[PDB]
Design an enzyme around this catalytic site. Structure first.
Site, PDB file in Angstrom:
ATOM      1  N   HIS A 118       0.990  -1.149   0.065  1.00 23.53           N
ATOM      2  CA  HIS A 118      -0.031  -0.083  -0.085  1.00 23.53           C
ATOM      3  C   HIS A 118       0.798   1.295   0.070  1.00 23.53           C
ATOM      4  O   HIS A 118       0.653   2.195  -0.884  1.00 23.53           O
ATOM      5  CB  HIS A 118      -0.834   0.153   1.265  1.00 23.53           C
ATOM      6  CG  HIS A 118      -1.659   1.314   1.491  1.00 23.53           C
ATOM      7  ND1 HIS A 118      -3.117   1.405   0.933  1.00 23.53           N
ATOM      8  CD2 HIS A 118      -1.328   2.447   2.025  1.00 23.53           C
ATOM      9  CE1 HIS A 118      -3.530   2.538   1.111  1.00 23.53           C
ATOM     10  NE2 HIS A 118      -2.539   3.267   1.828  1.00 23.53           N
ATOM     11  N   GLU A 119       1.715   1.373   1.003  1.00 30.83           N
ATOM     12  CA  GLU A 119       2.754   2.597   0.867  1.00 30.83           C
ATOM     13  C   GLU A 119       3.520   2.755  -0.218  1.00 30.83           C
ATOM     14  O   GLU A 119       3.737   3.856  -0.621  1.00 30.83           O
ATOM     15  CB  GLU A 119       3.786   2.406   2.238  1.00 30.83           C
ATOM     16  CG  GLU A 119       2.832   2.344   3.563  1.00 30.83           C
ATOM     17  CD  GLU A 119       1.698   3.448   3.900  1.00 30.83           C
ATOM     18  OE1 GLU A 119       2.117   4.473   3.101  1.00 30.83           O
ATOM     19  OE2 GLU A 119       0.811   3.001   4.260  1.00 30.83           O
ATOM     20  N   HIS A 122       1.910   4.714  -2.668  1.00 30.63           N
ATOM     21  CA  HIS A 122       1.966   6.059  -2.422  1.00 30.63           C
ATOM     22  C   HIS A 122       3.508   6.553  -2.838  1.00 30.63           C
ATOM     23  O   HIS A 122       3.621   7.465  -3.362  1.00 30.63           O
ATOM     24  CB  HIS A 122       1.969   6.490  -1.150  1.00 30.63           C
ATOM     25  CG  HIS A 122       0.615   6.448  -0.536  1.00 30.63           C
ATOM     26  ND1 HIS A 122      -0.617   7.112  -1.356  1.00 30.63           N
ATOM     27  CD2 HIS A 122       0.119   5.699   0.537  1.00 30.63           C
ATOM     28  CE1 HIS A 122      -1.749   6.903  -0.530  1.00 30.63           C
ATOM     29  NE2 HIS A 122      -1.398   6.010   0.420  1.00 30.63           N
ATOM     30  N   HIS A 128      -5.062   7.604  -2.587  1.00 31.48           N
ATOM     31  CA  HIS A 128      -5.992   6.328  -2.186  1.00 31.48           C
ATOM     32  C   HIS A 128      -7.118   6.509  -2.980  1.00 31.48           C
ATOM     33  O   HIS A 128      -7.542   7.232  -3.925  1.00 31.48           O
ATOM     34  CB  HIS A 128      -6.722   7.030  -0.624  1.00 31.48           C
ATOM     35  CG  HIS A 128      -5.700   6.913   0.262  1.00 31.48           C
ATOM     36  ND1 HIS A 128      -5.557   7.583   1.520  1.00 31.48           N
ATOM     37  CD2 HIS A 128      -4.891   5.730   0.567  1.00 31.48           C
ATOM     38  CE1 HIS A 128      -4.757   7.402   2.295  1.00 31.48           C
ATOM     39  NE2 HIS A 128      -4.287   5.900   1.733  1.00 31.48           N
TER      40      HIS A 128
HETATM   41  C1  2NI Z   1      -1.913   9.197   7.144  1.00 33.66           C
HETATM   42  N1  2NI Z   1      -2.233   7.849   6.477  1.00 33.66           N
HETATM   43  C2  2NI Z   1      -1.400   6.681   7.065  1.00 33.66           C
HETATM   44  C3  2NI Z   1      -2.480   6.051   7.631  1.00 33.66           C
HETATM   45  O1  2NI Z   1      -1.779   4.679   8.063  1.00 33.66           O
HETATM   46  C4  2NI Z   1      -2.273   3.522   7.037  1.00 33.66           C
HETATM   47  C5  2NI Z   1      -3.467   3.393   6.440  1.00 33.66           C
HETATM   48  C6  2NI Z   1      -3.809   2.749   5.768  1.00 33.66           C
HETATM   49  C7  2NI Z   1      -3.077   1.336   5.232  1.00 33.66           C
HETATM   50  C8  2NI Z   1      -3.498   0.305   4.392  1.00 33.66           C
HETATM   51  C9  2NI Z   1      -4.507   0.506   3.630  1.00 33.66           C
HETATM   52  C10 2NI Z   1      -5.052  -0.562   2.623  1.00 33.66           C
HETATM   53  C11 2NI Z   1      -4.425  -2.003   2.667  1.00 33.66           C
HETATM   54  C12 2NI Z   1      -4.584  -3.066   1.800  1.00 33.66           C
HETATM   55  N2  2NI Z   1      -5.096  -3.932   1.182  1.00 33.66           N
HETATM   56  C13 2NI Z   1      -3.171  -1.997   3.408  1.00 33.66           C
HETATM   57  C14 2NI Z   1      -2.644  -0.829   4.277  1.00 33.66           C
HETATM   58  C15 2NI Z   1      -1.732   1.365   5.865  1.00 33.66           C
HETATM   59  C16 2NI Z   1      -1.227   2.341   6.940  1.00 33.66           C
HETATM   60  C17 2NI Z   1      -1.680   8.094   4.928  1.00 33.66           C
HETATM   61  O2  2NI Z   1      -1.770   9.041   4.228  1.00 33.66           O
HETATM   62  N3  2NI Z   1      -1.010   7.037   4.291  1.00 33.66           N
HETATM   63  O3  2NI Z   1      -1.317   5.553   4.259  1.00 33.66           O
HETATM   64 ZN    ZN Z   2      -2.375   5.254   2.250  1.00 35.46          ZN
END
Ligand code: 2NI
Ligand code: ZN
Ligand code: CA
Ligand code: CA
Ligand code: ZN
Length: 163
Positions: A118-119, A122, A128
């Site tokens: 996921h990261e 980005h 998203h």
């Molecule tokens: C502030 N916010 C961070 C929140 O922390 C996060 C939020 C979501 C996820 C995530 C979402 C979907 C899958 C799947 N399949 C795996 C991991 C990981 C860290 C962000 O902007 N970055 O993700």
């Molecule tokens: Zn994210």
């Protein structure tokens, strides 16, 4: 799906470096989860990820807790699992994982492979997605990591950016 600004890398071969590790996993399990995560994206784009063991890489990966120098401080167990920065210099593209999470290479909270995947979305310029089944969905939702093949929405996303 498309990060606002359409930010993307200009190089196709990007280096990455796991700066440190989480005590909950051996460096191997982390290594494996990280490599497989990049592979998910490389098999759906022209990007090629190369690991370096020391030095500066295009994509730095690290496990940090609370305040860790980029002022998107983590928050202890749960909540923010990790974050990454869009393609850019220095911190751009970097992925940080909250060291206080219960990281694992399996399906329970929280699968490092899935979060890293996921990261890295980005890190490559993806924002998203509103598709609950997409890897880039805002909230962590485990999916069969074994035969886990990048969701179609995510493929469309990365293809839209890099072709
Ligand atoms: C502030 N916010 C961070 C929140 O922390 C996060 C939020 C979501 C996820 C995530 C979402 C979907 C899958 C799947 N399949 C795996 C991991 C990981 C860290 C962000 O902007 N970055 O993700
Ligand atoms: Zn994210
Ligand atoms: Ca957290
Ligand atoms: Ca970087
Ligand atoms: Zn950070």
């Amino acid at each position: 799906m498309l990060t606002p600004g359409n930010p993307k890398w200009e190089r196709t071969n990007l280096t990455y470096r796991i700066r440190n590790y989480t005590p909950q996993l051996s460096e191997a399990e982390v290594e494996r989860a990280i490599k497989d995560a990049f592979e998910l994206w490389s098999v759906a784009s022209p990007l090629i990820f190369t690991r370096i063991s020391q030095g500066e890489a295009d994509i730095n990966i690290a496990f940090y807790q609370r305040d860790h120098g980029d002022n998107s401080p983590f928050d202890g167990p749960n909540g923010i699992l990790a974050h990454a920065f869009q393609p850019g210099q220095g911190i751009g593209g970097d992925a940080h994982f909250d060291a206080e999470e219960t990281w694992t290479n399996t399906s329970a909270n929280y699968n490092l492979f899935l979060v890293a995947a996921h990261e890295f979305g980005h890190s490559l310029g993806l924002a998203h997605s509103s598709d609950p089944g997409a890897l880039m969905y805002p909230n962590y939702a485990f999916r069969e990591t074994s035969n886990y093949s990048l969701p179609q929405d995510d493929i469309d996303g990365i293809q839209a950016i890099y072709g």
